[PDB]
Amino acid sequence: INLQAVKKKYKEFIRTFNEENFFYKYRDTLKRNYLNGRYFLEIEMEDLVGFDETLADKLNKQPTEHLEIFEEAAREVADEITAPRPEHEEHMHDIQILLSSNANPTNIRQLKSDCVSKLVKIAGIIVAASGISAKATRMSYALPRKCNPKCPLDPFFIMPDKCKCVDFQTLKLQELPDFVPQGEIPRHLQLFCDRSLCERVVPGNRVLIQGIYSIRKGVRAPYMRVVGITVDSEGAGAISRYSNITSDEEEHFRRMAASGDIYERLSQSLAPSIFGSRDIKKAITCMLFGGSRKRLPDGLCRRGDINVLLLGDPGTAKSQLLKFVEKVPIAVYTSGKGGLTASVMKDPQTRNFVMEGAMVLADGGVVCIDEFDKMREDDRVAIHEAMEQQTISIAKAGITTTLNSRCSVLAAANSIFGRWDDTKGEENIDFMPTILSRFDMIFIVKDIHDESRDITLAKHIINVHLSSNKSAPSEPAEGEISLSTFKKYIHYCRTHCGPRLSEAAGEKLKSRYVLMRSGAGQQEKASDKRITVRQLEAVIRISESLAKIRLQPFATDEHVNEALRLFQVSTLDAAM
Template identity: 55%
Template sequence: MSGWDEGQLFYSDPITGDTGGDNERVIAKKAFLEFLLQYRQDNVFVYRDLLRRHYHLKVFNLEVDLDHLSAFHDDLAERLKAKPGDFLPIFEEAARDAARQILATSTEETEAPDIRPIQVTLTSSERPVSMRHLGSAYMAKLVKISGIIISASATRAKATRLMLQCRSCRSTRPWDVKPGFGGAQLPRTCNREPLSNEEERCPVDPYQIVPDKCTCIDQQTLKLQEAPEDVPTGEMPRHILLAAERYLTDKVIPGTRCTIIGIYTVFSDRKERGTSTVAVRRPYIRVVGLEVDDSGPGRSNTAILPADEENIRAMAHEHDVYDRIVRNVAPSIFGSDDIKKATACLLFGGSTKVLPDGMRLRGDINVLLLGDPGTAKSQMLKFAEQVAPIGVYTSGKGSSAAGLTASVIRDAASREFYLEGGAMVLADGGVVCIDEFDKMREGDRVAIHEAMEQQTISIAKAGITTTLNSRASVLAAANSVFGRWDDTKEADENIEFQSTILSRFDLIFVVKDEHNRERDEHLARHVMGVHLNAEDPQAEGEMDVAFLKKYIQYCRMNCGPRLSPPALEKLKNHFVQIRSEAHRQYVETGKRPAIPITVRQLEALVRISESLAKMKLAPFVSEADVDEAIRLFKVSTMSAAMAGHLSGAEGIADQQAMETLHKIERAIKKAFPIGSRVSEKRILQDLDNKVTSSRCSCCDLLLLL
């Protein structure tokens, strides 16, 4: 024991050893205080300056990077991750003491100013944990997960410290409430001792809450769902409840992609009546850090390394980069080169513009594939979903207006209404692939009008009035009215969509299954080759799908081309020309085109030209890009709009035959009522009686019947 006599100093570090709880709390608080006051980068005290700045701005919030804490005191950071429920309140007390010291030294006041409680929020560069891996091993620990917010409740006041008053003796006492969704169990008896033996004790359950003297904070309930690209094939996306408090409330809306750092814990869900045992609890995450992924359209979880960026820029400067990209768009599909080029333009998109008055012009391209079955339309949609940075695939038959846009749901526990985002909200910044577009109900189809042009979804239901973002491209596939495209009918008879929805598509392709022996041989040979080389990775194409996805992501994030003066002049002249052609067709035939040619088609040409320039990482649109955009527009939308209208010397004979055929149809409809059952023999006999003795083209067509 000579050491004690010599006056030496002995100490122990409770952070690393087993000590009492109070002593550990004091030492941990000192360590947190030292970190906030002493941590610096490049001779700058990071958190000391941050606390001073926030106090003058009346913002009582401090965001701490866990990497900084690990670099300063690694064991303290590990304790915080393992027991955040115990150490985070100590951290907040240390932040309040640090702010009091900083402000006391920076002012001339003799006493330290009164500091309101400071909320410490955390951020980290660690990889997020998959929502499917959250289990009992993570209980009461700090976790980091990412996903999409699908619903957000209104902000409510939650009491953190109750003031209880006895009904009998009127004495008061404070009572703390657990954070998160945890409630408070009020004491059953009064703590006041009777003054004499004759005085009766207060009855059981004497306390009532005094609302005006309670301490409250803001709290919001969120629901986080897995990102679509993280959900395994055939699985249902999982979701988990979040509890956000104080400065973390009202930070996100449905459809927002974010990363959450929080404490994984449980609460008792009283509405689940079937659980008779107290050991069954519902998990949730108490949020202590929230990072909104606001990098804009084209965001993705795929990291682009410097080596990838070098390869991307090298490929962009090649002269045949456009052809290479098109060859790697759905290489398993035979032919359909123009459709692949349109899909490539859709994946890259144009340039989004925000005008000085706040109006936003969309840069996303919408494409409609309309035509015969068995032409690989759905396969093209599946490929676009796979390659797009954010892709959502849905079928028109199983989709409703609320499922595509947003729905208003009533919470079963609180009976309050809240929003849940649909497919177009969840695909914000990506591509929505809608198959069987013609099978949708007309009312559901009308619901996406605003989402396709203004790229917003306005909700005004059950007292909720808000606007959600749906900045996504739409790639839709549909069949014609008769299942197959009927060349004997006009375009408006084959297309059952209204002009309001058709004008919102930049490119509309009529896909026909043409019977050609030579083409069928090439098609059969290609399909057999795909089946034979299904396991060969080189058979898919010369570019890896992962690299193509990175290339698309990089171009969307780092390139926003604009029109050059020559390209602008050429687009203006072409728009005037196609409007003149549409008007001339209306004058000659007396029928307006099934697909209207409006100013939206001019903006579509601008977007397609910009997407072609974006593939080459070019800052300006060239005349070659405009020429290719005009060609794509002519073979798609213009061709579909003029379908059924034959003109020129080569179409005179076909036009006369079509007129005769329409005459026969009108005669049949006039002779026999609609819905009646008449034999074919009787129809031919009645028409044969009306035929004149002289042979004409009508007689020839009648014999063909």
């Protein structure tokens, strides 16, 4: 029945939730949502078993009705508490509910006819979703014949001064990469969202989802919506924009910050299976942290982030490292074969020139690629541009919407003949220097021989490659632990501090770069044959990154001797 539910059960349910400690309610939560305009509420799905043993097993079967008996109970229990006296219910207001659980996730490949008009739980991934048009509830579907001398046959004028308005967003879902796409490609699905959950999910994230598989019109169509979404914890599966982090988390964080044995701890963090290569690694982690995007009263929106390089003989674990940098806030990865054009296609509906837009998708994330080498030049010029001004322009048809995106970039490579070029002269790149110039890092890889190193890289790998070893003994090391922390920690540290230099750093850095350029020019003159602003404006970013690390705003050049001794590697690499 419609009323025996609202008559007592839902209406007293919220009223009855009782554990001493005088918290265990959804009443106070409802009011402290109400006060601040939120208009929502969350529940589990296995608390009702703590109230009864039937209603839940009715919630699954006829959800669409129960989830409005809830709304009626919600407002009729909440407007009593709106009343300070009968004189401050200015007017009532509508709410939306959320429910959650921890039961079990599913996969798209089992969404079939039996799992229809029924609650579920899944786990997928996102690509993109629509804009925000509209939808409403009532105003003053079939609109029948009668009129209300004659007035004939359906003369109905909508009075939209007297209509209403809620939201509408149409979310999307693709599967995960480990549920038999092997002999296939991945399918996907489109969705639906209602009132307060637009701008709750940007594309490119891992989801938990609570939804329902229902139709619109025997070949008729699918779709799904949210029935109280939540999110993922792949380490920190969804910790990408919002904050349910608590003072405990800030406390643990900043207590880690002042701990002055964190950076040399973090130079051993990425590889619980690889040996060595530490000076290569001291600034693969700073690349995430980023420096400062300082605009000024003139134009100079100077380059914020940093950029990476590496090229070397195979056999030194390039691929795993870059896959790991993808793994550990948000990022994507391709390598070669992909663009120079952007996406001016045309929805066959309405025949216009829309802009679908994927350096877009790293506007706070980053990007990593291998093979700038083995992808030719028809698609390098748009990326020549993007990574120096970030004002990604468009001028194709009658649109000049030079949008922008702030992304960094990481580059692997492969040179011909190994260190054949790297011993002799000008075959470092085969193509051009202005994407070798326009970067920051300059880190070459070699695989030189020595018997001690040989035997050690022998047994070091065996204990790694023996029987999925690292259950016990990885975290028992000092502090080389928990990428999940690194995700949430970065998404703090980048989004708070506004650091910049001291006085004493400036003169020392100027003199040092002066000596660097002078040494380059002397190599020009000491060989009778043949230094940007970019090098200064990049190495400053490592000071930026370090001060980002320890959370000190102002940093020193003695703090940055490490950074300039990292750049020393670049200098003595391109020594010739």
